[PDB]
Design a protein around this ligand. Structure first.
Ligand SMILES: O=C(O)[C@@](O)(COP(=O)(O)O)[C@H](O)[C@H](O)COP(=O)(O)O
Ligand SMILES: [Mg+2]
Ligand SMILES: [Mg+2]
Ligand SMILES: [Mg+2]
Lengths: 140, 459, 119, 140, 119, 140
């Protein structure tokens, strides 16, 4: 019997329970994105503004149901509308990580028919980050 | 002129020449008349006693316009491979219905007729809710998009888990189980449908400890977490009392048993939820009493349309593959009916009418009951991302406990999603995807080992 | 009791036929607001069944007409009339309109017959 | 007249007012546990999540009566059901402290008849912990 | 529909002449509290136009005088009288004073004529 | 396409989106003040008390609409009433920054007819301040 660690095992939604994505696994996702006609976009956040919290709820009455700070990250440029080129997306991931080496960066895609974000996964963790575990040391 | 006495319903209520109006509510009944009762008369009886008519001629008819108000049987198909079974089509004018009231709609269409001596069995298969009627409903408090937006969760199914045993756990223990499941990687846990407030665990105690588990798990994982606290109760006042406390605790989501609670109570709750930003998970407790048999009852697709109108953010859709019945083609149909804006007629999937929801939000199908990690690819294949999959036993039954149980299911789902996205066909390479992941993840491996032989196929 | 079991793959059909509600469970319920005896005592009606009557057509009648039909029924010697189960509030007759006119009918029939009337 | 110190004299419920338990006093408790048929279990928490606080009450209305964060610790494996072996419990205490050298660790036991935790005391304090006092320096 | 556009530089004049309100939108409105049929039923008035009368002078009459005028109009055979559109509550006549006196007028004219009256 | 940075690009109301003021651009503002008859004054705040927050709202009911802490800075001496001398204001700016080298300092001006502050811009940022960006590094 192995024990799943509480310290410090912070996850990041879709695909963070899998092994970290290879530059080619990331490219396979981008193909899936362009294949389906979805709008790609990049978002980023500094170390603090990355996790869900609720310090603005100090200003609220009894209305803090489904309110959490740090859902919104900062948009890299604009979403790439009708841009059906997998190459150019990968280039923007690079441009972005280069510009914010210390930021959390995620790739997201929008469906405009259902008007919703249809997929999203992390592409860069900052190097100073000490609150995650490598895939093998998650249970002791 | 007023002519006292009994006559045939067909004289007034069978109109096979009628052109349905864009605002008429349409019903498709699976009729089985008594031997010697002509289909046309039986169909008219159903139309009559579900709208304006009784058993003998009343004089008051002349004071109003029976033409304007009457239910009309307007078409009868014989059922292939059946001696005495027909599909009777009834059109009801919009005027017949109270705006926004699922209760009223069901009171007319399924109120008395199912008990008639003149028939052996009756089944309501489908309803066509016209946009002008749909627009009278508040409908779901949030719906799929808004829910995903509120929870900040995208590009995969959601994972849940009913705490077990159903009854018997104390409040403190309940919260303990909840924390362990949530921190392993499930999005949601839930009260069992019959966990309300009982001598072994009073609701407010539970709500408090569960709120604490929700928050510990959230801080630990950094992902948003939830627990469907049950607001189902004996009286509306109690039901509200619980919903209020949940709001007061800041938790994201409550659940209600709409059918045992009832439509009236449910619509109240959905409105409260809209007004307070609470997500509303709907459990379909008791549906099988009504929807299981082919010859008699109301088919679930109707009970799902109803719920969408009454209001709910999630509704249990069944698993197909799990411990409870659910045929695949029909399920794919009512899942479209739950989620989509516009669903074209398709008799292969039991969809008798084109249903236009005119922008009413989508209800998220919840697949739950007797499922485990080996079903994962079949599940992802059936429902896609917009679904919530639940592993009760499939989590609290894992040999290493709830956190590893959770972790297992989360890895299983994440693997299939990646597989699907990478191009792999999940209907065929299913077992492969799962197997690759067990050899990779210890927790998943332990799970696959225990439930490898376990299937639900019968007769 | 009837929540999930009816939908099990392991069975073809299930029917709940009866339940034994023990006194100790029974006592936790407010139960019926009045009950037979008290109803009779309130209505002042004894030694016979009570007579009632659903207004017809089920739907389509205006509030004013509804009341009219009620009054005629009640004065003839029926104890009660009733809205049809699906008479709630609809475009052809809104509930508050109905309630008002029916109240008037009830009182007119009561005064005329000298017997207690209801709807 | 001696003065009981307010700095930093943080306690830990049952037995934390006695002198710290010897490996054998711990074993004596475990005998008591097995003697009575109770279910033993181990729980642990990192330095922060160890003490009772209330930062989630920022999300509440007037309903924070008997709500405190960090009552729940993380379960070590599972509770040891019907495991009537005192040796094996002591081994799990060791397995646990070994896996989390920096955690607070406590041994607890459940009665399943009354459905309540029936005893609980601390077995490991982390080494970095500066907020407790040795038994003799509690009063000056 | 009529929010900004009428003020555009790119046009000289704009007029909205009609709207098609579709049934699906119409159904979302409570609409009129009663409507013609229910009104007639409530008032018990059938088979002719109804007769009304705005009290004059528009402004300047006391509450007591208002009621007086009302009673005289109503008793002569008008169905309704009314406050002038700009009669609300003002220094020469406060609304509650008027309501009370008018109520009295309505009832007097009603008892006298035996016809339902209103203001 | 350049991206406006979220880190740490904290601004300071009027004029903080322009390039920092030259001693002579500052003097040009002071001429505008005195030319219009407005009362000059100086305000200052330590590194913490400089930015708008809401930690006193912990004591509030549902009444924290348009309440923020740190709107009020500390007054340097008094407002300079009828003092129609541009020289002397500049001298006070100097006297002030001298006395509080580590403080945020702003120049404000009051119209007493309308009874409102009629202008205000920063004049000193503390040297330890790491949460602002130079005008050219605001977009990458
Ligand atoms: O009570 C139960 O059995 C469950 O909690 C599942 O538990 P397990 O995961 O442990 O099986 C659900 O309520 C059923 O899914 C209801 O069925 P349905 O979805 O058809 O309404
Ligand atoms: Mg359940
Ligand atoms: Mg009836
Ligand atoms: Mg006028």
């Amino acid at each position: 019997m192995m024990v799943w660690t509480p310290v410090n095992n912070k996850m990041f939604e879709t695909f963070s329970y899998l092994p970290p994505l290879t530059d080619e696994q990331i490219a396979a996702q981008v193909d899936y994105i362009v294949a389906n006609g979805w709008i790609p976009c990049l978002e980023f956040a500094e170390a603090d503004k990355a996790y869900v919290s609720n310090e603005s709820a100090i200003r609220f009455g009894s209305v803090s149901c489904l309110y959490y700070d740090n859902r919104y990250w900062t948009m890299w440029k604009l979403p790439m509308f009708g841009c059906r080129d997998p190459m150019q997306v990968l280039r923007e991931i690079v441009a972005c990580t280069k510009a914010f080496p210390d930021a959390y960066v995620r790739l997201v895609a929008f469906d405009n028919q259902k008007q919703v974000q249809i997929m999203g996964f992390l592409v860069q963790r900052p190097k100073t980050a000490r609150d995650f575990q490598p895939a093998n040391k998650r249970s002791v | 002129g007023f002519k006292a006495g009994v006559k045939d319903y067909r004289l007034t209520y069978y109109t096979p020449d009628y052109v349905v109006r864009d605002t008429d509510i349409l019903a498709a009944f699976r009729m089985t008349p008594q031997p010697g009762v002509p289909p046309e008369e039986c169909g008219a009886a159903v139309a009559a006693e579900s709208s304006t008519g009784t058993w003998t001629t009343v004089w008051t008819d002349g004071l109003t316009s029976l033409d304007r108000y009457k239910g009309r049987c307007y078409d009868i198909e014989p059922v292939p491979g059946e001696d005495n079974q027909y599909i009777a089509y009834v059109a009801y004018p919009i005027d017949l219905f109270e705006e926004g009231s699922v209760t009223n709609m069901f009171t007319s269409i399924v109120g008395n007729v199912f008990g008639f001596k003149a028939l052996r069995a009756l089944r309501l298969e489908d309803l066509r809710i016209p946009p002008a009627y749909v627009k009278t409903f508040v409908g779901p408090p949030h719906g799929i998009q808004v829910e995903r937006d509120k929870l900040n969760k995208y590009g995969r199914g959601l994972l849940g888990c009913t705490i077990k045993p159903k009854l018997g756990l104390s409040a403190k223990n309940y919260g303990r189980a909840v924390y362990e499941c949530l921190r392993g990687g499930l999005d949601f846990t839930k009260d069992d449908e019959n966990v309300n407030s009982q001598p072994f665990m009073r609701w407010r105690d539970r709500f408090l400890f569960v709120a604490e588990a929700i928050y510990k798990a959230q801080a630990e994982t950094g992902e948003v977490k939830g627990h469907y606290l049950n607001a189902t109760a004996g009286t509306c006042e109690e039901m509200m009392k619980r919903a209020v406390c949940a709001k007061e605790l800041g938790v994201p989501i409550i659940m209600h048993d709409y059918l045992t609670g009832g439509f009236t109570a449910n619509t109240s709750l959905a409105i409260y939820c809209r007004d307070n930003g609470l997500l509303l998970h709907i459990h379909r407790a008791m549906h099988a009493v009504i929807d299981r048999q082919r010859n008699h009852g109301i088919h679930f697709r109707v009970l799902a349309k109803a719920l969408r109108m009454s209001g709910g953010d999630h509704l249990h859709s069944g698993t197909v593959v799990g411990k409870l019945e659910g045929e695949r083609e029909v399920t794919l149909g009512f899942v479209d009916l739950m989620r989509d804006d516009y669903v074209e007629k398709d008799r292969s999937r039991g969809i008798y009418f084109t249903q236009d929801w005119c922008s009413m939000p989508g209800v998220m199908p919840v697949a739950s009951g007797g499922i485990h990690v080996w079903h994962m690819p079949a599940l992802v294949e059936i429902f896609g991302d917009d679904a919530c999959l639940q592993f009760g036993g499939g989590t609290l039954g894992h040999p290493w406990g709830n956190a590893p149980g959770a972790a297992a299911n989360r890895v299983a789902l994440e693997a299939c999603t990646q597989a699907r996205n990478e191009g792999r066909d999940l209907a065929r390479e299913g077992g492969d995807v799962i197997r690759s992941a067990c050899k990779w993840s210890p927790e998943l491996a332990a799970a696959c080992e225990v439930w490898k032989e376990i299937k639900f196929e019968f007769d």
